[PDB]
Every structure is written in C-alpha cells, then in structure tokens.
From Swiss-Prot, chain B:
Disordered: region residues: 3-38
Subunit structure: Binds to host ACE2. RBD also interacts with the N-linked glycan on 'Asn-90' of ACE2. Cleavage of S generates a polybasic C-terminal sequence on S1 that binds to host Neuropilin-1 (NRP1) and Neuropilin-2 (NRP2) receptors. Interacts with host integrin alpha-5/beta-1 (ITGA5:ITGB1) and with ACE2 in complex with integrin alpha-5/beta-1 (ITGA5:ITGB1). May interact via cytoplasmic c-terminus with M protein. May interact (via N-terminus) with host bilirubin and biliverdin, thereby preventing antibody binding to the SARS-CoV-2 spike NTD via an allosteric mechanism.
Result of changing residue 25 to N: In strain: 20A.EU2, Iota/B.1.526, Omicron/BA.1, Omicron/BA.2, Omicron/BA.2.12.1, Omicron/BA.2.75, Omicron/BA.4, Omicron/BA.5, Omicron/BQ.1.1, Omicron/XBB.1.5, Omicron/EG.5.1
Outcome after substituting residue 41 to R: In strain: Omicron/BA.1, Omicron/BA.2, Omicron/BA.2.12.1
Consequence when changing residue 4 to L: In strain: Omicron/EG.5.1
Span within the parent record: 453 to 501 of 1273
Protein's UniProt name: Spike protein S1
Function: Attaches the virion to the cell membrane by interacting with host receptor, initiating the infection. The major receptor is host ACE2. When S2/S2' has been cleaved, binding to the receptor triggers direct fusion at the cell membrane. When S2/S2' has not been cleaved, binding to the receptor results in internalization of the virus by endocytosis using host TFRC and GRM2 and leading to fusion of the virion membrane with the host endosomal membrane. Alternatively, may use NRP1/NRP2 and integrin as entry receptors.
C-alpha cells in the first residue's frame, strides 16, 4: 500500500496509453476525473493469476 | 437501457441510436475499437432478485 497525496492525479498519459488491457471505474468516470478533487489516494499493486 | 451519451438529453427525449460509444480521445471507426462500448446494456431481471 502506497499513499499518494499533495500532487496532480493526471490520467491523460494513463488512459491514452494502449499498453493496458482492462480499465474500469465503478464509482467515477475518466472524463469527469480531471474536474474532481481527491484528498488522498492509496495505490495497491499486486500480481495475481 | 442507455448507459453512455454524448450529453445530457433534454426532457421528454427518446434516443434509439445504436452507434458504439468511445470513452477516450482515440477515434472509434467502424463498429468497434479500443475502449469502445455498446451504449445499450440489458437488464438482469430474475425472480430470485
């Protein structure tokens, strides 16, 4: 678990990249993500089958 | 039901379009593309629900 805060959570370089396969947001939308402000974002990275 | 639209529809408006939807900057030519989703999604109605 890594805490991300006090920065700009840009996603243009994230969504536009085609190197990813599946990317779904069940609570928000990428279009309105830019105009949305977050307090703290935690990134949990793991490798699974 | 319709899940994605270019903009909010005016009151008492019917949208029967079946054209695919693009959720990013990349173009969506033809009937499919990268991150191209069909705007019409079925309903999961079951008696057990």
């Amino acid at each position: 678990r890594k805490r991300i805060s006090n920065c700009v959570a840009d996603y243009s370089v994230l969504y536009n990249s085609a190197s990813f396969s599946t990317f779904k947001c069940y609570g928000v939308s990428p279009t309105k993500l830019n105009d949305l402000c977050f307090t703290n974002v935690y990134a949990d990275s793991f490798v699974i089958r | 039901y319709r899940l994605f639209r270019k903009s909010n529809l005016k009151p008492f408006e019917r949208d029967i379009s079946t054209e695919i939807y693009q959720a990013g900057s990349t173009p969506c030519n033809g009937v499919e593309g990268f991150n191209c989703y069909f705007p019409l999604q079925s309903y999961g109605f079951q008696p057990t629900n």
